[PDB]
Design a protein around this ligand. Sequence first.
Ligand SMILES: CC(=O)NN1C(=O)N[C@@]2(O[C@H](CO)[C@@H](O)[C@H](O)[C@H]2O)C1=O
Ligand SMILES: CC(=O)NN1C(=O)N[C@@]2(O[C@H](CO)[C@@H](O)[C@H](O)[C@H]2O)C1=O
Ligand SMILES: *Cc1c(COP(=O)(O)O)cnc(C)c1O
Ligand SMILES: *Cc1c(COP(=O)(O)O)cnc(C)c1O
Lengths: 830, 830
Amino acid sequence: ISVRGLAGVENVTELKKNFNRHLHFTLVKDRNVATPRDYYFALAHTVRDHLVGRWIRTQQHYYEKDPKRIYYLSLEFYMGRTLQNTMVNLALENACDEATYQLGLDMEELEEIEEDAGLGNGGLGRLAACFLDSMATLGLAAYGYGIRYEFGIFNQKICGGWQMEEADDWLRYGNPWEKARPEFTLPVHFYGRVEHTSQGAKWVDTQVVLAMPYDTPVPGYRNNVVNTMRLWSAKAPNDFNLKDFNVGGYIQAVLDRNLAENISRVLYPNDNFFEGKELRLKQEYFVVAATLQDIIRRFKSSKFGCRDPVRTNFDAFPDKVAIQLNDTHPSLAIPELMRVLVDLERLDWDKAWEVTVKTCAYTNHTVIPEALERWPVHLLETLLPRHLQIIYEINQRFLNRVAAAFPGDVDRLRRMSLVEEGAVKRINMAHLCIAGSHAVNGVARIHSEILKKTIFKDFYELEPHKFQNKTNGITPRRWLVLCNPGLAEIIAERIGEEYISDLDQLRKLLSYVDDEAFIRDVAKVKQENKLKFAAYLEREYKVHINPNSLFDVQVKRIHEYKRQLLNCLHVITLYNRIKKEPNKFVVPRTVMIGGKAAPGYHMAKMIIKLITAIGDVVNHDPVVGDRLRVIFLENYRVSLAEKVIPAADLSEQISTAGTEASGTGNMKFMLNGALTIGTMDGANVEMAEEAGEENFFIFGMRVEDVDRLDQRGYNAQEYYDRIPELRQIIEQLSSGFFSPKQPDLFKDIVNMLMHHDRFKVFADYEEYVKCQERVSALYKNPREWTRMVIRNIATSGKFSSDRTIAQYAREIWGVEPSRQRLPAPDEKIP
Amino acid sequence: ISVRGLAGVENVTELKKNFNRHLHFTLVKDRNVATPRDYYFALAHTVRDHLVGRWIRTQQHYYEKDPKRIYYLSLEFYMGRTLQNTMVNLALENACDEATYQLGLDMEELEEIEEDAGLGNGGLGRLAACFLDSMATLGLAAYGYGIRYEFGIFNQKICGGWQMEEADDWLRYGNPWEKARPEFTLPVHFYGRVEHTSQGAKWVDTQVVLAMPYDTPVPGYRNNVVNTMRLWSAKAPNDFNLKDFNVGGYIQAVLDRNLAENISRVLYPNDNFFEGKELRLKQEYFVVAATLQDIIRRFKSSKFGCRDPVRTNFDAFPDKVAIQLNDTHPSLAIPELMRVLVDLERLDWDKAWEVTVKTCAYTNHTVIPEALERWPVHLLETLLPRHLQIIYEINQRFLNRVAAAFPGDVDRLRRMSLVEEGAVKRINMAHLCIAGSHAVNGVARIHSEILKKTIFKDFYELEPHKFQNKTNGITPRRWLVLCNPGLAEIIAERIGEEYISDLDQLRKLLSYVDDEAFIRDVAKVKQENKLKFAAYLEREYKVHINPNSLFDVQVKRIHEYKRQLLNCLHVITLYNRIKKEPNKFVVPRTVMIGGKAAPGYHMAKMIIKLITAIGDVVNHDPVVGDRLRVIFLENYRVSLAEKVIPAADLSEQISTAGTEASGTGNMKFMLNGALTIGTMDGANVEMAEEAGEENFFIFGMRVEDVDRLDQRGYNAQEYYDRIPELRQIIEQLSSGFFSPKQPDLFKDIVNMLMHHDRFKVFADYEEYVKCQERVSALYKNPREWTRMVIRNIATSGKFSSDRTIAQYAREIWGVEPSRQRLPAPDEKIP
Ligand SMILES: CC(=O)NN1C(=O)N[C@@]2(O[C@H](CO)[C@@H](O)[C@H](O)[C@H]2O)C1=O
Ligand SMILES: CC(=O)NN1C(=O)N[C@@]2(O[C@H](CO)[C@@H](O)[C@H](O)[C@H]2O)C1=O
Ligand SMILES: *Cc1c(COP(=O)(O)O)cnc(C)c1O
Ligand SMILES: *Cc1c(COP(=O)(O)O)cnc(C)c1O
């Protein structure tokens, strides 16, 4: 059937009876009233059963051996569905497929019932998910720590071409994967005030919110290792949240509990954008405070909570603990670790600081200013008074370091301060992270250089040793084996299976680049993938596409820097040329654009309306026929990505050079047989560098060109004046060609494009359509297109998160990865 | 060990492995980190497993056979713990005891970990719970329908002698008994307006709240029948509760969902008291609306949703459906059933009314005015506009009936109206229930007569056939076998086990009233019970009592009509007499008073303070010694009741004649070997009548005396003037003898007692202490005390809820009870 494992005689039988056990005992249903949803749960529970054994021995193991622990703090974990992934990592896929088949059910139909764990916005969140899978696969004693939002990223609905947001109640029917652990609930403080008494400061009169943990298993790939992702939930204490007496109402007091519990209710839907709301800040301290207590408790037991030097010496803390900050969201971990060490454990400042810096590491994910976290001092002042004091003190000592290093450089001092003066005083969380971490890293080579040359230049000069780079990656498991079994199979037919946990081995595929059978196969799976997607489209969304055309897709969050607008310009261009010479041949294309817009991002929502507007016109022009279709992919999410990417021919990664830190969708497309048209931005550089620029469609300005243009000054009128095709499009928008009933509908877009385009869309237009013409040319030659594809796939190995994690492990965490199978799952009950 | 069933070889082994299965697979724990709480859950899950099989066949059965269905609507279901009860009803107690023993655990210690299902306030709620158990035991196709509050009755804490309320988070660690059924979620409407168009009215522009059901199994006693208790939970729709667009905030919209969900958040903590809050009304319509849809859906399938006359003829509705209104809380069911039938199903008014009246029955539980539900019209007008219109129409036609029956009786008309004029117009829900039900019943013989003679006199004259009586009862299972296995065993040693489901058989115990062994035994278990309670006291609450003294206990909600104050007066009297003649012998007593006070009931909270105040004085007077102890039982609840009642010697049921509708705690004490000192109130009358007045300690005014006094006019001064002992107590309170630091602390109590005692406490004082002297006398003669006890126990049979239910079934529901074992639980998988 494929190498989804063995469909053993004993195990298929075993599976079936346990499926029935759960349907009866767990779901309390009988075959006569069971629905597909019930069947999905029975299976999920059956599958989950297989990894609890491993989960328990894994955790027990780490307790015995006591290795250094890696704590990945992130406010986002974009998990997606977990049934299939679990089957894949446990080699249960074929057996489950067989068993369910024998039970007269279609496993695939059941898999579609699982709701996505959308606890993330996009890149940053998905990265964390890929990392977890890699850390488990590499045998690291790692823990993912975050917030259990009961409402993840909103579900996107298109009404009249506009985006409509609606709550994502992903827990509505329950989550069979998580395990509530109310017995490990912890208290988290807010507000209050600071008392300075005799031997130390005291955080007093605080409001208490409780943090209840929920553990979700994270299985490594076929190595019997199952790590843990701990998500915190906010709960109100039953005392003060009722006991602070003297009138108010008993009922009201109870109803008001949903005020402390609002902390974990919903994820903020922003991308590369910072919103300074109090609820956000609360979420940030909540996950940090709870997590740290858990970390220290585990440390206090270790082998120190037995003997060792005997005396809670935190000197070994860094040798046993490593906490990675996914961006600045969990940045309060730094001053919080200090608070605990100094205020509670009573360590001297300097010893505490040494420990803190030595255990913390910070990862930066962007360089655009509006994304940078700068919290107003009055907010920190009210909500976390002691943390502010600690920050000021950290700042004080850091600046003194600077002054001593750069005597007299007074401007440098203000530039480097963690405190920003002006309208309102703010705290620069990024500066905080740099100062309190022993390593700072970018997510792509160019992005990392930009940090050193630009944004954090002063810090780099101060401590050059801190700055590193760790190019992002993706998990071959979910992003290949899971979503594209067809491709994985044919690759395995030639080079084996070892590449799934050693993606570098894909290079061996280079020697089949001239293989006639392989070329035919690679081309076949892609055709099968396109057919399946084209079907799904009519199935769940309804209104036909042509599977023979070129599948041109751009899927990612909607943003000005991502330039979906540039994609738009090209689409309109294709349309106008066809209308000009109707009876001239052109390579057919289905351009698919999908992505979510943050609710408050007006422009982004305007662009979504533009895309659908273009489709309204283009898709109903008889002269166009089936040569050009514009489709907006609704509710783009992980599960949807697993469907489009394998069916994509052309991948669009066209952000303005210097704006996309790295990107990861680009890597997803490369490993799945799509060709890339993009700019020298983020990881695109490393990808083209790995496959060879001849096998990549690069175009547009490089970072240097962008800066040159800025010196000069960007004037869009120029481009408008010299390119008639561009002018024609702009006047079509301006006159209502795409919005008849509301002719001025797109005035904001045009206005922006002509007068305040921060991402110089026009500057890259000419080179973009020219480049687009080259891909159309190559598509006309199936054999050569496919051969170029094989060159990309065979050369994507470097982009697996296993590689990324191995680097973090060795160069930052100080731990050694291991592909050693944990001692089976085998029963055991001590 | 006892007749808690057989500890079979095969089953104890089977139990043990499943206990381990759950500990591992369900709790995901290993023996090395498992805590008593974990062990409790493993067991609960193991036990629950045994009744899912029966649960499924029971429900399937009713579907096949299709009998008349009984729907018990109540806003309260005081369930308590359910682990033991389930073991008892399934004959699993000894086997589980053995198995856990072999696993090296103490079952009793684990049982104490289970949280109480406190979804009730007191009598009314517990009645519903006893009823459910009886309906299952009698094989009735019955369903308990209510609201799943996430916060039940508050947990009571005594601080400085005052009551402190704190949220009852009973779901904190999960509820292994319930089964969420999100697939059966239903919509419930609120607000909106009424449109009158061509063919009918339309309830329009309503706000939608969703009702998610949660099913809990209700096992009959050893008959393999497992009925269902369906509790509704409020959930917000993800559309409009987000989709009603045009600014507000996406985050805020999501956080505001906890506004529609507040409907099922907390139970109102009132007793015999009506609070006209909107949230209450919402809760009332919520349970009614959701339940009815479920009822009709089930009806539409039946055997009509196949064939029958073919044409949704609701003429058979009453032959297939019976809905019992537990008080007026679910009274909206009447106008709602009309709305659906008329507005949606399109039946003519008259045919709809005939059906409604024929399927509804109303149970009244009190006669005090402040407890009567009278909803302001402006509230119904805003929240349920169409229901108001229907009510007005019902009223219109009903009054026309009256006018025709009593021509010219204009005052009768206003008296009988469902609409009350005055300050604000209100709707008399009780009048509504009488008009729309075919039967109205009281809960005790005297209470039922009072209804006919007083409160509902006019209605009785109009339709004498509607009024009936159904004396309350209690379940011998929980209230005997479960809480007093010792007593149940010795009874069984003589007369067998058949009495557990046929309590009348207890009469046979009469022939052992002179049996020397029995007398010794009955006396022994009570001594053992007292020792165990005396221990528990020091264990969990701490500060000694004497097990040889007379256990004088009064446990029930704190209320003025319950007269805990009268009990107080007596206690102080005993104290004063001892202080007068220290070296005179008196029978030692431990008087225990426990009960919760509604948060807003100032007087009731003042009484709690008085009781603790008396104990402060009495318990620390050296001259008193161990002859008199005053203890306030904290957080009185079902699980606590199961502990005190079996250890009680004297039961206090001293409400002012005519105020306690029935009472059920009184019955609990009688069946557990306690003697009763009380007034001729509620079921006390029937109890004394059943055991013989010679075996009961009756005292005080009868109903007639109370009325005589009211004609005359009640003047407490008189009693104060003629009884020196009474005067002495009042001046002690007034002068601060019991409250030194705050001398005027009890001015409200004294003031009330002297000037506004609605329950003439003083009028019954003399006859009360005199009577108390007679019980002390009899306690001095162990052999005769015990013989009187045997007379009560042997004669309590009539007070089992099986009897009550059998009567409801035959005289109101029109169904025949059956003690037929359902065809085993045996596997089966169709
Ligand atoms: C999470 C999100 O929507 N935005 N988002 C960021 O703010 N930073 C992002 O991080 C990812 C992962 O490191 C980068 O690949 C991406 O280029 C960067 O924009 C990213 O995707
Ligand atoms: C529920 C509650 O606390 N109060 N409460 C009532 O309002 N009515 C009550 O109903 C029960 C059960 O029918 C009666 O026995 C009791 O006498 C009556 O007061 C009762 O106990
Ligand atoms: C991989 C992924 C992303 C990242 O896409 P980019 O093109 O790097 O912005 C975002 N959303 C989902 C659903 C993803 O799978
Ligand atoms: C039985 C019971 C009641 C009823 O007691 P009464 O004396 O009838 O008011 C109230 N609360 C609990 C906990 C009960 O068990």
